Structures are given as C-alpha cells and as structure tokens.
Amino acid sequence: VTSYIGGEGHNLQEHSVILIRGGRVKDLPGVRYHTVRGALDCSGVKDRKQARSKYGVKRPKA
Amino acid sequence: SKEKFERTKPHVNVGTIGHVDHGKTTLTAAITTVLAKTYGNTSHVEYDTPTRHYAHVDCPGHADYVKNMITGAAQMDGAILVVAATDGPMPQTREHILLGRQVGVPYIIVFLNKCDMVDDEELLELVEMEVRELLSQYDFPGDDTPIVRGSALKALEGDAEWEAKILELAGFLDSYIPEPERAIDKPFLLPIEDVFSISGRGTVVTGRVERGIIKVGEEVEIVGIKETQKSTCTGVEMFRKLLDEGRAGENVGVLLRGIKREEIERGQVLAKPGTIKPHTKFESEVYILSKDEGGRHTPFFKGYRPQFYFRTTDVTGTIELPEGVEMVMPGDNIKMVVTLIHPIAMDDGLRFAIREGGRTVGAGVVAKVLS
Amino acid sequence: MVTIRLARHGAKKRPFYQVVVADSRNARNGRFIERVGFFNPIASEKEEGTRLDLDRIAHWVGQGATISDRVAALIKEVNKAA
Amino acid sequence: ARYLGPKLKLSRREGTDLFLKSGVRAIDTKCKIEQAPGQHGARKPRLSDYGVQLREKQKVRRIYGVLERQFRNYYKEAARLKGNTGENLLALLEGRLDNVVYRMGFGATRAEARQLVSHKAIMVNGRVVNIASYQVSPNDVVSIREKAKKQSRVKAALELAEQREKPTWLEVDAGKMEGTFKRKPERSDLSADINEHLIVELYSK
Amino acid sequence: NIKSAKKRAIQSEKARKHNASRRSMMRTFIKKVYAAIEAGDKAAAQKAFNEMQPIVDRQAAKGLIHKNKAARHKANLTAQINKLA
RNA sequence: GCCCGGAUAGCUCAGUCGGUAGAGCAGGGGAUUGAAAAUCCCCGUGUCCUUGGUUCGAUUCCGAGUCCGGGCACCA
RNA sequence: AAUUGAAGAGUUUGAUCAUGGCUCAGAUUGAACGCUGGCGGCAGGCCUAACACAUGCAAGUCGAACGGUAACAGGAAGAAGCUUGCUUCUUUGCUGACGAGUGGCGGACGGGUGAGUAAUGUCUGGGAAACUGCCUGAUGGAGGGGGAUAACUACUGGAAACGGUAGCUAAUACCGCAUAACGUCGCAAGACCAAAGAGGGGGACCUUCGGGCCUCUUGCCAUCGGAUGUGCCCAGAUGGGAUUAGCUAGUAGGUGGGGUAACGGCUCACCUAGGCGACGAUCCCUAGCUGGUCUGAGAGGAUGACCAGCCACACUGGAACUGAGACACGGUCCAGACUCCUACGGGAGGCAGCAGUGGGGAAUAUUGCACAAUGGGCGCAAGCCUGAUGCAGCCAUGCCGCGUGUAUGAAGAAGGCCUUCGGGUUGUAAAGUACUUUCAGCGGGGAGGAAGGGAGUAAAGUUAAUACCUUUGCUCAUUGACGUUACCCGCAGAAGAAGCACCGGCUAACUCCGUGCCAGCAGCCGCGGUAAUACGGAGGGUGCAAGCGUUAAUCGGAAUUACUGGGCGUAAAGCGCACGCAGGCGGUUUGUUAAGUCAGAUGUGAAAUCCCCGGGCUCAACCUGGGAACUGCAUCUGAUACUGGCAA
C-alpha cells in the first residue's frame, strides 16, 4: 500500500514499522490509507492541543 | 524450578575482577568444585558454605564488556581480585581495580593465580608486593588486604595441598567480608540487569533487590525506558530455586506476568506502584574528576553529551550549565541541569556516574526532579 | 437412563433450577425430553416458591425414570397431604 | 453522569426557565436570562427544524437531569407501551424518584432532591432507595427516614414548595415528611409548555 | 499415554485372544457344513449342521454373536441343507 | 549484551587517503500577476548524524553515543 | 394484551428538470487504535496458525466379586523393662481398613475445536427391514462339575521402558454337563440354546464345630414388554461458477451365494444395458448446518460469536480390536513427519481438555479456589473422583445503575479573551457562607444460596423374631469455595473521582491571533494565493459522558437488482430479420376428476431467544412464570367457482 502520513512533521524514515488505517485522501490518487499517528514507531505530532485523540498526542502534562 | 530455597546463612555477592586469561573462571569453578566436595555472559555460580551463602558472579574480563561488568560489579559486595602471579599488574587489572573503586565495592581479596607455574620465593612474592602497592594506588587497604596464592587448575583435580589452599580462600572470604547491611524497610525497588524468557513461563527479569521485599503475587510497576507498565509477580527464584519473599540485597529472578520479551528491556525497574516516577530532566551536584582522579583534563560547555549511568544502564544526556558560569573546569564541584534522551526512574539524591570517552568523567548525585 | 433432575440456570449468584426429565448422559443444561415445573432456592416466602407438575412426574416414575435426590426432596416438599 | 456544571447557563440557552436554579429565592434576574447564551448570545439563530428539535429535547433533558442514553431508553420504553408516545415519555420522566421527591417539596431544586435520594434520606414503602432512576409505581408512599428527617435543609426546602402549583397526582403529609404518590400524572397536568411532539419527532428519524 | 486405566488395553488383548479363538472355531464348524453342502452329501450335511447348531447358539448366548447372525446361519444354512435333502 | 556497517544543504549525490564543504535539481528575494507558471534581475539557504579527543587546524584521524541495517550471543 | 407501522440531505448546471452514481444522518460489533479513566451489577473475552508446545492437573471407583496384605490403625500368643501390667516389644489378616493384583463398571458421557463436508451433513415431514449397557413392568430359572491364570515365591533378561522360563492359589473371571419355554431354526415333526452369588441378622434344629437351616437386601440367566439412545430409508428444502456439456462400469437393474443388529452393489458370481443431465449431472471455487443474531414498516439482505440441537475431527495417513454403544481426544497396532531420552540394544511424545508458553496477528485473560451447590462416574451406603460445573483474578469489550456534591453567593472581583475600549463575556461560575455523605477509605454487625448425610429415638411394615432391614416422624451434633460475601450500622471530612469530539454547508455550536495554494485539513462538497467562521493556537459554544473519537464490518437509507416495488424512441438498455424444438401462456359450452386452490380437524413446529401480561434482584440491565408467537410441513374429511388433467 501507500498510506498518507498526516499531521505536521514525522519521524518516519526508510524503514520504521508503523500502523495503517483506512481512509482515502481525495487529493492523492493511489493513496487510500492513513497512518495511525502516535501508535508504534510513529510518534504523535509535536505541540498539538486540539483534536489530540487523533495524531496521538497525550494530554498536556503541564 | 522445584526445590525450595531455605533462608539460612546470610547471602553475600562476590565476583572476580582480573585480567583477561588470568584464570578468573577456572577459579570461580574451582571454589565450587572444592566446597561441593569437602562440604558435600556473566555466569552467576552459587556455593553454600556453613558460615555464609555466597553468590559468585564471574564477569568476562575483556575490554568490550566494561559496561555490563559495571552493573555486574555494582551489586557485588566484595570482589576477588584474581591476579596471576606470573604477570602481576596488567592494563585490564588496573582497569577493573579502578572500576571496582568507582563502582565503590567496599572489600577486596587478592588471589595470586597459577602460582605452581613458577618455583621461586622472590619472584612471586615480588609481584605480590606489586599488587599490594597497586591496591595502595587506589585508596584500597593494600597492606591490610589478604593476599592468597595458589593454582586454580590444581584446585580442579585432587592435589589436597592446593584444594586446601583454596578452601582456606573461602576462609578469608567469610573472615574479611562481614555480614552485609540490607534495606529491608522502605518500599521495594529492583533494577533490571538481565531479561530472560523461560519456556512455558514467560519473561524473567533478574538482579539484586535494591530494597524491600517481593511477596509472590504483589502488584508491581515497571518504570523506566520507553514508558511504564503494570504487572504482578508470579514466582520469585534463587539460582533455579523457589522463593517466598524476595528480600533485599540478593540477586533474584522475578517472573513477571503478562509481559513480552521485547517490551521490557534492560534498564527499567520493578518499583512498587506509586513509589517512583520516571524523569528526563534533573538538577544534580556534579563533581568533575581531574587528571589525578582519572577523569577529564579539558574544559567543556553546553552541548557536551556524556553518559549518565544509574542503577544499571547509562543514557546520553544534554548538559545545561547555571548562569554565572561560562565553562566547567576539570576537578570542580558544580551543579547542572541535565536532560537525558531516555527517561529513567529516579528520585532526589540518587547517586550516579557520568562516564564518557570510554572512561569515567565525574561522579554526581541527583539534586532535584524535573522531567 | 431417563432421570428427573434440576437444570441449574438463572443468573450468577442467583441460581434458578428447572427440574426436567432427561437422559443421564445429557449435559446438565443440555438436551432433555420435557421440563416439568421449576425450583427457586432464593425465592423465599412470597407469591411463588416451587411449582412441580406431579402428573407428568408420576408418568415417568412408572416409566423407570430415577428421581434425583433434590427433586425427590421437592416431591416430598409439595407433599401429598400438605 | 450528572451535569454538575453552571446550572444556570443552560437556562439561558433554552431561553426559558429550567428551574435548575429554582433555589430557595424565587425569580432570578441574576444571570441576564434569554438574550445571553454566551459570547455570541446577541445572535438571532436561523434555527433549522433539526435545531428546534434538538433544542427541545435538550430543554426537556435539562429539566429532569436525565442524560442522552438513559433518555433514549425511556423513549424506546415509551414506544413499546400503549396509549400515545407523547404522554408516555413525560409520564416515565415524571415517574423518576428524584422528580417525585422534588414535586413533594423534599428539597429546593431537582438536583437537591437527587443529592437527597442518593444519600439514603429517602425511603419509599419502608424500602430505602438510592437510585434516582427508580420508577415510582402508582399508589406508593415516599417518605424521609427519621435519622435524616427534618434535618435543616429539608425544612426550608419544603417551605419553598408552598408557592409552587403543587401536583394533584401526588400528596404530602407536611407534618412528618410522609408523602404519597398516587395516579400516573395526566398529560394536561405537567408541562403544557415543553413540547413532546418535537421529541417524538427527533427519535423517529 | 500414561494412564492407570491401561488395564483395558492388556485385558482387551487378553480378551481378543480367547474371543478370536472361539469366533474361529465357530466359523470353521460352519465351513465344515458348507463343504458338506458342496459335496452333495445331504446326510453328512444334516450331521454337520447338528454338530454346529449348539455351538453357534452357545456362542451367540455369550454375546460373541448377536443371535441375529446365529439365526441367520441357522436360517439359510438350513435352507440349503434341506433344499438339497 | 557485543562486533560490523550506513548517516554530507529541500531531494539525489561528488568530495578524503587534515588546510577553510561543492554538483545537479529544487527553494527564497526584487520585477510582473488576484496569486502563480513562463520571462528577467539576484542569492546556498549546510549543527558535513550528535559530542569529545589528538592536533595551529579534523567532514576528512581516534573515542563514547543516538537512529537504522546486518551477524553472533541470550532458558530463573 | 401479544410486531400502532415506511422522513430525508449534499454533490453534475449559469439556472432548471430528469436520469444516475457517490456521500451523510440510524442501528449494530466476539471489534481494534488514539486520548482520557472513580465504583458497582450482569454478560463477553485467539474471529489469524486445525501453528509447534515446557509443566501441573483434566477419569476413576467398588474389600457388600476374589486370593491377598505392601503400609497404617486396633486386637491377640508371646515378649522386656521396671512405677508387674506401667511400659518395651516380636509374632498375628484375626478385625478397622487399604498400596500393588485379578474381576465388574465407567472410560463411546462430560470438555474442545470447526480442518474436512455442497450432502455420506443439516432442517422439515414421513417411513420400515433394526438394535438398545444402565433404569423399569410382567413371568419363570438360579442344578450340578472342571480346568486355568495374575498376584505371589525361585531363578534369570534389559540402562530404562519392560519382561522370560518353572512352580503355588482364589472368584460374580473362564469352561463343558444337567436344564428349558409363548426363545432360535423349521411347514411341522423335531433340534438346539443360559446362570453367580454375595452382605446383615437369627429361635429351634443341626455342628467332622468349615457351618448347615430361617429370613430380609442385592446382584445373576432367559423371554416378552416400556422408556430412552442409536443405525437406516425416502421426499422437499439447503452457496457461487456454463469463460464447466456431458458424466458413469459396481456403473443402473436383475438372479443367486456370502455379509450386517438391520434393508441395500453393502460384497463377489453370472445376466440384461442401462442410470444420471439443461427443473444444471459432472468438474471448479467457497462453506460445518440449524434454532437463532443484526438490520429492516414488511418482503427481504447480511450472518450463524456466546446459549442449545445435530454433524465432523482428535499430530498426519490407515487399520482393526474390546464393548450395549467407538471403528474410539487424555486406548491398541502400523507407517510417516516432528521433538526428546539412551548404557544406543531400544524406547517416549501428541494441549482443536483447563491454565500457560513461543509464533502468527490490529487484536483477546489466571500456570486461581473448591467440589459447598447442580450434574456425571463408581459404590449398599459412607465417601472418592470430576479444569463439567460453581465461584474468584484479569481486560471499559458491551449493556445497565450511580457517583464526581447541593443550596446560598455581585464586588457582578482577579486572570483570560474580545471590543466602537463605552463595555462585554467567561459568570453564580470561583472564592465566601450553610449543609450533605451515597460511592470508594476505616471499624463493627451480617443474610441467603443447605437440600442433605451422620448419630440417636419412637412408631408402622418385614418376619419364627420386640434382631437386621426399608419407610416416616423426632433429638443432638453438624456440612460454604465464593467470603476481609450481599446488606445494615458507625467514623471523618467536599473531602479521593471529567474527559473526548466538534463549531463553512450537510449537522447542534463563533470569534480573535499566527501562516500565506506553504504548513495543513478533508465523510461528501471542498478550504488555504496576506482580513481563513474550513489550517494551527487561544477564547467562547455545542454534543456526548466514564467514556469520547477514529478505523474495519453488516443492514438501513438504496424503489441504485424493483417478489412486494424499476426500467428499455433520445439518459444504460429491443437481438439486423425470421423460422422454430423444449419452456411459458391460451377462446368458448357441457361432464368428470380434485392436481393446484380454499375451508375444517388432528399431529408436529425442542428449550431458550423475539413479542405481551405478571414476578424477583433497592432501580436497571439480567433472571424469571404464564401466554401468544414459531409466517412451516404432513396426513385426514370437505368445497368446487378459477386454473390443470381426461372426455364430448
């Protein structure tokens, strides 16, 4: 497959095992999948606040 | 796992620290073959004598292993400096002695190995004096420390003379090293130093119990690198023997339930839930070592990334110096705030060694928790 | 061997037996010929306690069906004169 | 479970008076009712059919303190019943013990009644009950236990109920806090303002 | 597999021994009869049938034969030896 | 746990066997436009994986490390 | 009383109207993942590898079948000390009993899994050519003999596993013989066919003192039954593929012989050449089936996890043996692959039992406690056995309940955010003040699941008998794993307990700042090109709440597979035209038949589940009683208009 890496910025490179959910992007034909940000080797987006259940960010510890 | 380990004769850790191919292992086998006769990776051999219950850990002496040997010599109470009477002091010898001083092992017994190799009362005695002085070199008692001699191979056969000599070796063991103090009071905490996967049982963490007890079935929290996971004990062990309450001060093998082999790496701790919190930033009263201390010899500033060895494993860390200070001169007492990449369970006042460049750099203690 | 026996059903910690004729080899909550009344141990004293269709039972007694100890106790409890 | 937030903002959102801060004192005017839902409360909503439906359902829920789930359960329970769904839903919402207790005057607001019932002050038919969702069967007798009888709050909280319309479907002893639930309330008794029609609509889709 | 109730194995073999032997002798008397039939000696046939009847009923009673097989042998075997006799 | 590799601007890479980092392709700035592309006029815009060392001076020599790949080891 | 029930929206265009897809609003789940996470109740928890499995346990029991006695406890001949009856202590099956052993029974049940299976299965309804241990009804029998062998001793083989030869012995083991009928064969005559005894108590009598005799209990053998269970047979129904049209030689039938509990190409011998197929045979792919579950106004569509019935499998392939029942999960033999043991000569293994491990995977639990309850095995019973079952641990996996406080509280504060800087808003929110304590924390009380069974006693039966025995009252002693139970009472203090998604339209809810077709968002339509209600942050609001989202999946909406309920001049769509077999359909009058059709009746349509009315857990979920429902199928007696068959 060829999943779309969402959020802003990513730690993915070369290999690195990730996690793949469904969902097209409707802008990149051929891409019908998403990456589960925050799950496995794919860290969550840095410094997010709203809608952090997606993108995998934990509740602001501060 | 079948025979119950009866709790008699105080437990004591004791491992060799000699030069490569000086007969450390032959010795660590000889002691057992002798005591198991007349009395009827790091290999942890065991031998029980009427006076004490010793747990010899024979760590490989090569240079590439001066990292895991740290931990192996950390839980150790009194090392057996096995120095060959044919070569005396050597690079690795001094490396371990120095390391066995930075780790801070209280007591030490010198054993001139392979003495039958030479037939002289002046050459062997000479190198003996050499060793006694080299001990004085590192603030060890030196002249006070006993110097046993004898072959480790002859202790393998039936040469009653050398078997007797190494039997008395055990006498010097029980005499020179007193009953150790334990920490059976404050909440239980065990640093992992070796992870196994026994078939039909699962993951088995090992290591000396830093404090407290481990009654089988108690709720435990695995805290350290990566994150944090809950678990419960299921059968504590003692050299392939069963245990009830895993007391403090001795090496054990806890079988953690519901944990995979790859999800509990070496470095984490089995702390009682609510007793500790993992951290990635802390202030510490760092004491830099000089050339007379064997540490660094040149100044450094922010950006310097040395190792911060703790209960077992080390971890690279970012150094941030307090304002009013430009650079850190070697041999100074200065505090600083550190941010290590891998989170490690720690509290205030925790002792630790800042090693770097294949050599130690500066001892320190944790001042304040931040994370 | 046909036998009359309680079938243990109902909730957890809240047993509700259903006396029933069934082959002895059958699973407890398994196959059966016909249920014949019920027993309610935790019912206490109220509108109901233990129903039991004596006619069919009597049909199976002369049919060779061995009544189990509990069900026998119930046959006693429903009596024939009380 | 419970809402336990600003129990007066909701009253502003619904624009009417949910009697949430019905309180001991009478009429509020201590919140700028109606024309102040929030920062953009001055806005006049276009208000879509859905909008009025949802708005209605919420009004009613905020009245009786019932959440969405339990509510929808009440709905399915109303549809499976006889009569007509509209009367049903409100009769079942009326059946809740915290609601009946509230009607008796045993407590100022409805949430007060809830906090009373939950801490074993309420005893119906001699059988003490905690659950507010307990549906009070017709011809029951709700009361207050002696160990919690006339304990400060309940007194004044019952003095309050004297100004209320007071239901004809239930009665109160007033002399020893020994009330008596009777018939199932007629539709033309409660409400006559909250619209069951729109609620029936909302779950019909 | 290790199981104390393995006595069923050694006993079932110790049983197939005897039972097999009996089953054998029976079917061999039956054979004797069939040969009598093929020879055409209706007299010696009747004789052999008389010689086998009690030993088939006797083994049929012992559960070795289901006394259907016994009646079956007695049935058709008689139909033959008397169809010729 | 250990040994051996790979990590040079946005992307793909040349660059050494210490002397002061380039190549192509992209991207930025001014003109033009609603904003672009084309067109014109100008620019590397880089923690040579991080840090330390030996050096006057290290991408380039020697340690310790992180991330990855590969090999060996790992039954209280 | 018992289904009172069917909603639409966005998007093709400059706009419309159609057509036509796409998408959303619902319900659902054995779900996973992200964030957050207090409690209780009831359920659920390896859907991928029928992958490989360390270790423990999952099936034993009967001394009232027997010879025994290896332990243990009592008793006795005798023994040694010494307080000579207080102790030491060898013999002794003689009792209580009970390893190993023979024998009986069970081990074919219970538990698991769904690989194989497109019918050798399942479901529905009938059927005849059967058997059926245990349980039970009826009627008789139960006479008299023998020979073996395990154990056990002697010796000896093998490392173990595991025997070998030679002796001794018992029985409800084994075996003739007597004995027989409404039993088996036969037309009958006639022929033949079985077995076991043990335990309790006992007056006379009889004792070579082994006991005979009496009696109750139980087991034994035969037959006919009953019930139950199983085998078998037929019809209908039970996935997709014609880009699979022919397949079949034990094949289709017959006759005879054998074979099975039983019919039968079930199997041979010969004979006839048939049999199946366009109402889809064969071949291919996929699949356990059903009651049901989900959805739906219904018809339908998807599914069949838990619960229950059936079927199939037990490392792989094959085979039989024992038995009432297997061609057998924790049996046997054989081969094979795979693991381990060895003294290398040979042996051991089968977790799709419960836990557990590795591996796979997005993904699924304790190497728990107990037989106290229900059920099973065995036994006279006591008891034993039981990973069935009952509980407990675990996981928000789901449903349901509750809590996280209530009332008062304007200075309408601080801070935050916004502004036309006048103010607003967060906001009765907070602090303040007054009460409250559920739920967790702590300390006390405390149900119910327990019925039985044992000891004793009186009575009525039994009987030669006030003895034993069976039954019923009646007394004492008692039986709980859950379990520091539910539940109540007391203690302290608001005290320990709120998140998640969203805010352009669909869709409930808006602004400010940061960025500038970049970074990003996106279910659809789409936003971002320096004034973004669409990105990121903040403020505010909305939704839901111990959860909230996302993803995957099914149905709905979708009358977009239309049977109910669509189309085909131009939107997708009349074969280029004809002839025509099978198939479908068929004018009109009379007769008959009654196939369809309809009416009635009876049988069945397992229980649960769904629905309705009640009952019980404080409510709910859940449990539960009765009822209706199970839209079906079959036989039976009618009707005869309409259709079909036959007739004129």
Ligand SMILES: C/C=C\C=C\[C@@H]1O[C@](O)([C@H](CC)C(=O)NC/C=C/C=C(\C)[C@@H](OC)[C@@H](C)[C@@H]2O[C@H](/C=C/C=C/C=C(\C)C(=O)c3c(O)cc[nH]c3=O)[C@H](O)[C@@H]2O)[C@H](O)[C@H](O)C1(C)C
């Ligand atoms: C360092 C390795 C493991 C240590 C781990 C940690 O050690 C500790 O931090 C430990 C606490 C005692 C600790 O501090 N160790 C961390 C550091 C500790 C430093 C301490 C003690 C100092 O004293 C101030 C220490 C130098 C002091 O000098 C004396 C020795 C001088 C020798 C000089 C040799 C020199 C020049 C030399 O030529 C030389 C050589 O031969 C070989 C190699 N290279 C050299 O160059 C004596 O030996 C004293 O010990 C804790 O025990 C932790 O719990 C720990 C176990 C995590």
Ligand SMILES: Nc1nc2c(ncn2[C@@H]2O[C@H](COP(=O)(O)OP(=O)(O)O)[C@@H](O)[C@H]2O)c(=O)[nH]1
């Ligand atoms: N001849 C002799 N050799 C000895 C004696 N003791 C030890 N050795 C040698 O030491 C070696 C074993 O030591 P080893 O375990 O390799 O050293 P380590 O690994 O550094 O402990 C053997 O090769 C022996 O030959 C002795 O007494 N006599």
Ligand SMILES: [Mg+2]
């Ligand atoms: Mg070595």
Ligand SMILES: [Mg+2]
């Ligand atoms: Mg809820």
Ligand SMILES: [Mg+2]
């Ligand atoms: Mg347009």
Ligand SMILES: [Mg+2]
């Ligand atoms: Mg067992």
Ligand SMILES: [Mg+2]
């Ligand atoms: Mg005596």
Ligand SMILES: [Mg+2]
């Ligand atoms: Mg025995």
Ligand SMILES: [Mg+2]
């Ligand atoms: Mg005799």
Ligand SMILES: [Mg+2]
């Ligand atoms: Mg016999």
Ligand SMILES: [Mg+2]
């Ligand atoms: Mg006859």
Ligand SMILES: [Mg+2]
């Ligand atoms: Mg024939």
Ligand SMILES: [Mg+2]
């Ligand atoms: Mg025949």
Ligand SMILES: [Mg+2]
């Ligand atoms: Mg399959």
Ligand SMILES: [Mg+2]
């Ligand atoms: Mg397997």
Ligand SMILES: [Mg+2]
């Ligand atoms: Mg047989």
